[PDB]
Symmetry: C2
Subunit: 355 residues, 2 copies
């Protein structure tokens, strides 16, 4: 383990995240669950059916399917739409999860090609979407996490939804971070989800569960999704350990996304005041942003190390070197709100002394 | 369904480990500290020690934890198809990949399957010898769908040396490997060592919740970890399954002998009933199939009642066949929790009903 990561691990509080990712997260979700509650069974029965209906309702879709991962969930979605439209081409942002974080799973597992829309360092434009040829599916990710978490205005999404529909293109939402976006949009999950044909949501990002996903959409779409779920080896006999925990952290945190967002905006303001330091976006539209430092990790890590060792407050857990700067991702959760004012003020003065 | 109900409502059973409920997870976690670090996307805490543990148990270079055997085994077949430039694999007609996975192997991979033998029996060595060049032969020990029948160890040896001769990779579906060791009088390592790759399960005989290990050569496992991510099986945190798998492995690893002996006890009681038999006649593991003369219409009422009256579960479902109906029995911890007299009074009532 490197010096920076070490120093962040040995902190007693953090600005980002929910706390340590440990066995206690599962034990806490289960501590009041009756030992006699019956397990789900290969994608039906107890626990799973009510959870799926719940989240079909939350997203305002005909049905919803619990998956072990969003990786599996979104590959399946795209394949279903590709099959329905007899079109083997899908389009999305160049830094889409399916493109860069799944060992090319979509393309290795299905005869599907991808058009990367726009540029890597920005949102795709409405003109770029209108310039697309006949494709099966456009995937949008709200927000675009890989560029710090930027998203189009709600009215832009309305226009894209009408366009695609008027053109026969299926619109899929990568809503890994959908809950996080609701404060800024001033909309419910169903109002955002209603613009799309299908939706993926996660239970381990903003919500801070352990793992697992929901893919939601029309009834027939979900039926097919359940067959692919079995083909993929995701139709486990028992997925309750993730469903019970998922629902628990959902009920726990569904109404905290607003505070996480206000807090993120506060943190960004503090960071942007530092010489040699900025956020992207400058003003967050959610609980997240990227934090950029001029100079490379070999220059900046030691400063952060010292700051963190001394204060016992985690600002930065890792850096990623880029061209003349280095970057880390901040996502605000329960951890920040456990830092009292004096603990924030003392950390930030010490951080101010470093930069 | 009324039979299922009658079975679910019993306070003891001859089959299985007991109710599949949340308690099974909480029991496994009762002694794990809250502060234990999660695994992280296939590496780190919990997962690495588990994989190393099961590489050693199976005598292989490495091992990889999978959320399922459906996923594990498909991945193993593809890696061998790739390593061999051969797009055909072979196995028994009721192989789990053929009948219980919605054609996943063939839908997700440019692979074709040859079925070796006849559905109702073990394949023969001559049938293996008549196979064209293939990437992989998969053997299931025992063949579950025909009652749990398996070839003598000398025959497994012959077959392994033959496939080594022809450059055919040999893979074991070992979902029930542990249940067989008593019969074989062999270690897991001694059985596994006749194969190129091995899949084992943590929810069959061991009675955990879910999860699988795929073990094999270091190279093979590296590539299998890539496919695990492609598949969406490389979850940020698999510890709920891993920790529970270990809990139950440790708890039940040395009980396969008693399950096998207990299985034999049950089949003996069953075969002595008129209008009842088992396949195989004498179990070679903790399992067998149970056949009742007559159709489910005639038989399911009789079972239903015996179970309602006794509160002892013998049978939870019947499959209707020509002139008889069948069910699968797999002994775990539930048999041992019913005292002898209680099982004797259940059988006695059963004896009256048949």
């Amino acid at each position: 383990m490197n010096r920076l990561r070490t120093s962040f691990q040995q902190t007693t509080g953090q600005i980002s995240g929910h706390g340590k990712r440990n066995v206690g997260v599962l034990k806490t979700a289960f501590a009041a669950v009756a030992d006699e509650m019956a397990s789900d069974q290969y994608g039906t029965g107890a626990i799973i059916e009510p959870f799926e209906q719940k989240f079909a309702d939350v997203l305002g879709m005909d049905d919803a399917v619990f998956f072990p991962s969003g990786t599996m969930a979104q590959q399946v979605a795209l394949r279903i739409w590709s099959d329905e439209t007899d079109n083997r081409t899908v389009a999305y942002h160049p830094l889409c999860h399916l493109e860069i974080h799944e060992q090319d799973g979509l393309k290795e597992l299905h005869p599907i090609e991808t058009i990367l829309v726009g540029a890597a360092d920005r949102l795709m434009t409405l003109d770029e979407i209108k310039a697309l040829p006949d494709i099966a599916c456009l995937l949008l990710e709200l927000p675009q996490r890989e560029i710090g978490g930027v998203a189009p205005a709600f009215s832009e999404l309305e226009t894209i939804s009408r366009y695609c529909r008027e053109r026969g293109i299926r619109l899929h939402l990568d809503g890994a971070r959908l809950f996080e976006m609701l404060p800024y949009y001033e909309k419910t999950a169903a109002e955002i989800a209603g613009l799309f044909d299908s939706i993926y949501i996660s239970f381990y990002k903003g919500l801070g569960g352990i793992a697992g996903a929901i893919l939601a959409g029309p009834a027939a779409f979900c039926q097919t999704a359940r067959i692919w779920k079995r083909r993929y080896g995701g139709d486990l006999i028992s997925l309750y350990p993730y469903i019970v925990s998922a629902d628990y952290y959902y009920e726990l945190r569904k109404d905290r996304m607003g505070q996480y967002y206000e807090q993120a905006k506060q943190l960004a303001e503090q960071f942007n005041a530092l010489p040699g330091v900025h956020t992207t976006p400058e003003v967050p539209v959610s609980n997240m942003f990227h934090l950029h430092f001029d100079g490379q990790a070999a220059d900046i890590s030691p400063k952060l190390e010292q700051v963190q060792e001394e204060t016992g407050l985690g600002f930065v857990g890792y850096l990623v070197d880029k061209d003349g700067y280095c970057s880390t991702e901040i996502s605000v959760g329960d951890a920040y709100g456990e830092l009292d004012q004096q603990t924030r003020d003392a950390g930030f003065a010490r951080l101010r002394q470093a930069f």
